[PDB]
Structures are given as structure tokens and as C-alpha cells.
Design a protein around this ligand. Structure first.
Ligand SMILES: *[C@@H]1O[C@H](CO)[C@@H](O)[C@H](O)[C@H]1NC(C)=O
Ligand SMILES: *[C@@H]1O[C@H](CO)[C@@H](O)[C@H](O)[C@H]1NC(C)=O
Ligand SMILES: C[C@@H](c1cccc(O)c1)N(C)C
Length: 532
């Protein structure tokens, strides 16, 4: 039966789901690792022991343990990201949407969700891959991994909690796709891993990690790169935060074994309840447990790797949104409210730049402010607000990505860059947040197609363009149709620096995406902070 597939791990029973008045197969909740429960907490992922009998892969699995967002109870704009499945440490599973009839060897796309490495679920609605699988005729796989301390606590040196296990969970899923996607009609030699936010950063991290390069063909990163200031930490920092977490639950801190044991005896929600008390600074866009530069998963500093071309060469398709910062200021910076225009004062503006650039000393905070302030109108609430919005976005998403892309292209086999700047017509967040972090996702997964979602005709059009770009890129290594009569997406070159818009208007090509502010963020401020 089309809904029955035999994989090296065992047989699997899927289900037929309806999609835009048609149907495709869906194998939901396939296990790709042994449940990281019990003494395996913090440990590296172990291969899911094969099973005999048919596995019911007709419904979604549990979502890993994670901090749920209760900032706006009932608000759909914030809960569409909260887990919609019973949380559980036993969450390592993957989902595959398969066209019908089943292909024989089509392009495959594995999706890695975002969430600041402390949250994320493959079962969210905007992550439903039936529309993409169906529309572009591709086998869509969305994996999952351990977020938070559960997947990132890092006591370097120990084998019980080495760290980066979350990324290992990911790789394990990628290996399972390499080894079995063929039985689902997928071409294991044409897998394109794509993610957003922490997911995009992850993608870049597999491109950098030798132990992963061999497991995928192409790569797509959205609103995030491996070198983002929040994506990784040093073993030292990671260790420090581990102890702090332990100290928060009154753990014996005499040895790693003493500490690790204590953390394993704590219920999941106990670690979650104090997770945020470990950060080193009062800051915005910073998460407790994230990938550490251990020397293993990451041979050396991400920068030297980038500089020495020590990374998988291939084609990549990445980009950012116009208002990345807005979401983190609403949640932490003083002055922003979900229900107001959030006009910011010079007092609060300053406080924002403080939270935004946590590692900066006074001179640094000064440089930033000077660089993002209209002194001919230093008291404009809208300016102070948007300026702050920009700061959070450039520093944390746009500029780090631009560094990456600039460093990669110099060794890559093709680079395509996009600047997504269309605000959905159905967005329920305040107008001031603009093109919000993670809202390009819905167009990538073609939600504008299903009418009951209330998108505009053009928005549906946009979705389809994107979906095709992504798919066509995954299949070929280029987002463009071989011979076409409509708009070429220029290749990004270290010389031209060309890039494109992604909105409901006629796409237009541009150059040097936010160079100005990124020469400051990537080249100046660093020098500044180091000299001082
Ligand atoms: C799992 O499969 C069983 C029969 O094999 C089916 O009745 C059930 O709906 C599926 N998922 C559920 C409800 O747990
Ligand atoms: C990609 O690699 C192929 C073969 O190695 C080469 O012919 C082509 O010019 C490369 N393209 C880019 C953009 O580097
Ligand atoms: C909170 C989170 C987020 C919020 C909204 C959409 C996303 O994809 C991710 N950041 C921190 C990674």
C-alpha cells in the first residue's frame, strides 16, 4: 500500500491527508533515535533500535520539553509558536510528507525549526509540509531536536553532558533521511536542509561541521546563520551557565558527575523554571543553552573555519526580513507594548541599546547610539523606536548573516540572497513590528494558498513564487527555471553583491544589503570593543 513503507529501521504505516482538494501521504512521528530519557538526559543521541511490526506513523509526536510563551495568553500571534503537542523528553521523531502517487526519486527537503535553541516544534501548523510537498512535488521532512538545557547543557570534558547534543539529534535525523528517504521516493543524494532562526543557524552549523557535511546536498538558511552572536558560546561560558543552572536547583556542585546527576533527577519543568536565570547579562535576543564551540562538532572557532574555507562547498539560498528586531524588543525592551505604537524616548532608547548590545562597554554603547540616531531629530518617538528595531535586527540577524554569506561565497558553488519585506495582510501583531521575525515561514510553507486563512490573491502569488524558488533551488542548485520568461534571481557574487526583494511588488534587484550598518557591526564595533 502507498501508505506502507519498509525502512531499514522497520515497517511504517502512514496516513493519507487532504491537501488543497487533493491528497498526499504522510508518515508522521517516525522515531530516529532512542528516547533521550532517564540517565540519557544531556547525552548524545542513540540510534533508534529497529522494530518489527508496523509503526503507526499517522499522527504527530510529542514536542520536546521547552519554555512555553505566556506573554499574551490566548493571543494567536504568539501561541502559534507554542507547542501544540503534549511536551515530553521523548520527542526525537521526524515527519515526512510524500506526494501521491509516491515518487521514485525526487528532490528532498528536510526542515529544521527555529526558536532560539530553547523552543521549537515540528508539529506547529505553519510547519505543515503538505502544501509544499504537494505544490512542488517534493518529499518534505521536518525533523526535531532537543532544545533548552535538555539539548544544550554543556559541561565540556564530560561525556555525560558534552553539549551540542541538540545538533547531534539533528544530524541523527539527517542520517536517517540519508539512509531511508529512498524508500519514500526521495533521492538521498538531493536533500536540501533549510531552517529559520535557530534552524537557519543550525543549517550553517552542519555546513561547518565535518561530521555533517556528507549528509546533505544543498542548504537554505532563513533569518539566521551559524555565526550569529546568540547561536553559540564558549565551553567556558557553557560550563559556567551549567553550574549556574545547577546552583539554581540547589545542586551539589563539587563535580560534573555530582552536578549532572542532580540535574537528571530534576523533573523537566524544574530546569525550565530557572533556565533564564543563567544568562550573564540583562539582555535582549540572548538564550541560555545553545551550541558550544567544543572543538569537536566545531573543529575551531567559527570565524577561522569561515576564513579557511573549512566548510562544505555547495550552493546556498539565504536571506532576512525587514523587521527582525521588533519581536525581541516587544518582549523585553522598556517602552514597547503589544497594544501601542510603542514610540520610544531617548531615555528608553538608550536602555534598549543597552539590552541590545550586552557585551558592549560604554564607548561601545555610545558608538551604536551615535550610529543609529537622527541627531537632527533625536527626540522622535517613531525614529527612536524603529532605530532600536533596526539595531536589534542588524546586530543579531542581518549583519551576522551578511558576514557569513560574504565569507562563504568566496568558496561556495553558488549563492542566492533574498530580503523578505512583505507584511502579511492578516497579521495580528501591531503595525509597528512590521515584517516580523519568522513570518516569511508561512509563505515558504504556502499557507496563503488555503483560502480559509484569508490571504490576498497577490499574497498567494508570492507564496507560490517563494515555494517554487525554494523547491526549484533544492532540485537544481538554482531558484530559477532553466529557460524562463520571468525575472532572474541574480547570483550573489562578492563583487556585485546583488540580491532581491520578496514581496507582492515586481521583484527588484539590489546591491550591498545594509553595508553601511554592517561595516559598523561586523568590522568597526568589534575592533572598537577589542581596542578598549
Ligand atoms: C494509530 O493507529 C491506530 C490503529 O493502528 C488508530 O486507530 C489510531 O487512530 C492511530 N493514532 C491514534 C489515534 O493514536
Ligand atoms: C560550481 O561548480 C562547477 C563545477 O565544479 C563550476 O563549473 C561552476 O562554475 C561553479 N559555480 C559557481 C557559482 O561557483
Ligand atoms: C523566540 C523565537 C521566535 C519567535 C517567533 C518566530 C520564530 O521563528 C522564532 N526566537 C528567539 C528564536
Amino acid at each position: 500500500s502507498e501508505l506502507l513503507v519498509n525502512t531499514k529501521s522497520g515497517k511504517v504505516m502512514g496516513t493519507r491527508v487532504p491537501v488543497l482538494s487533493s491528497h498526499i501521504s504522510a508518515f508522521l512521528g517516525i522515531p530516529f533515535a532512542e528516547p533521550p530519557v532517564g540517565n540519557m538526559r544531556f547525552r548524545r543521541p542513540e540510534p533508534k533500535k529497529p522494530w518489527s511490526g508496523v509503526w503507526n506513523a499517522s499522527t504527530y509526536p510529542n514536542n520536546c520539553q521547552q519554555y512555553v510563551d505566556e506573554q499574551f495568553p490566548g493571543f494567536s500571534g504568539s501561541e502559534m509558536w507554542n507547542p501544540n503537542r503534549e511536551m515530553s523528553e521523548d520527542c526525537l521523531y521526524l515527519n515526512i510528507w510524500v506526494p501521491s502517487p509516491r515518487p521514485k526519486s525526487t528532490t528532498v527537503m528536510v526542515w529544521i525549526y527555529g526558536g532560539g535553541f530553547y523552543s521549537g516544534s515540528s508539529t506547529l501548523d505553519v510547519y505543515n509540509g503538505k502544501y509544499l510537498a504537494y505544490t512542488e512535488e517534493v518529499v518534505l521532512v521536518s525533523l526535531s531536536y532537543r532544545v533548552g538545557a535538555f539539548g544544550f547543557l554543556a559541561l565540556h570534558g564530560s561525556q555525560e553532558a558534552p553539549g551540542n547534543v541538540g545538533l547531534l539529534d539533528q544530524r541523527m535525523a539527517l542520517q536517517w533521511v540519508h539512509d531511508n528517504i529512498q524508500f519514500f521516493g526521495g533521492d538521498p543524494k538531493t536533500v536540501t536542509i533549510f531552517g529559520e532562526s535557530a534552524g537557519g543557524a543550525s543549517v550553517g552549523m552542519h555546513i561547518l561541521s565535518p561530521g555533517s557535511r556528507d549528509l546533505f546536498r544543498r542548504a537554505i538558511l532563513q533569518s539566521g546563520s551559524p555565526n550569529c552572536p546568540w547561536a553559540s558560546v564558549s565551553v567556558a561560558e557553557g560550563r559556567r551557565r551549567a553550574v549556574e543552572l545547577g546552583r539554581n536547583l540547589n545542586c551539589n556542585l563539587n563535580s560534573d558527575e555530582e552536578l549532572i546527576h542532580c540535574l537528571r533527577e530534576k523533573k523537566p519543568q524544574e530546569l525550565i523554571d530557572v533556565e533564564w536565570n543563567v544568562l550573564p547579562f540583562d539582555s535582549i535576543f540572548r538564550f541560555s543553552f545553545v551550541p558550544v564551540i567544543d572543538g569537536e562538532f566545531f573543529p575551531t572557532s567559527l570565524e577561522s573555519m569561515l576564513n579557511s574555507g573549512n566548510f562544505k562547498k555547495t550552493q546556498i539560498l539565504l536571506g532576512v526580513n525587514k523587521d527582525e528586531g521588533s519581536f525581541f524588543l516587544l518582549y523585553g525592551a522598556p517602552g514597547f507594548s503589544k497594544d501601542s505604537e510603542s514610540k520610544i524616548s531617548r531615555e528608553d532608547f538608550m536602555s534598549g541599546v543597552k539590552l541590545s548590545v550586552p557585551h558592549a562597554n560604554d564607548l561601545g554603547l555610545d558608538a551604536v547610539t551615535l550610529q543609529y540616531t537622527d541627531w537632527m531629530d533625536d527626540n522622535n518617538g517613531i525614529k527612536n523606536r524603529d532605530g532600536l528595531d533596526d539595531i536589534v535586527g542588524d546586530h543579531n540577524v542581518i549583519c551576522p548573516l551578511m558576514h557569513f554569506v560574504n565569507k562563504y561565497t568566496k568558496f561556495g558553488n553558488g549563492t542566492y540572497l533574498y530580503f523578505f519585506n512583505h507584511r502579511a495582510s492578516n497579521l495580528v501583531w501591531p503595525e509597528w513590528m512590521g515584517v516580523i521575525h519568522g513570518y516569511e515561514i508561512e509563505f515558504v510553507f504556502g499557507l496563503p494558498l488555503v483560502k480559509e486563512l484569508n490571504y490576498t490573491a497577490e499574497e498567494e502569488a508570492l507564496s507560490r513564487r517563494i515555494m517554487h524558488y525554494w523547491a526549484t533551488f533544492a532540485k537544481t542548485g538554482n531558484p530559477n527555471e532553466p529557460h524562463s520568461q520571468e525575472s532572474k534571481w541574480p547570483l550573489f557574487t562578492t563583487k556585485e553583491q546583488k540580491f532581491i526583494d520578496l514581496n507582492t511588488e515586481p521583484m527588484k534587484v539590489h546591491q550591498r544589503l545594509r553595508v553601511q550598518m554592517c561595516v559598523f557591526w561586523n568590522q568597526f564595533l568589534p575592533k572598537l570593543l577589542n581596542a578598549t
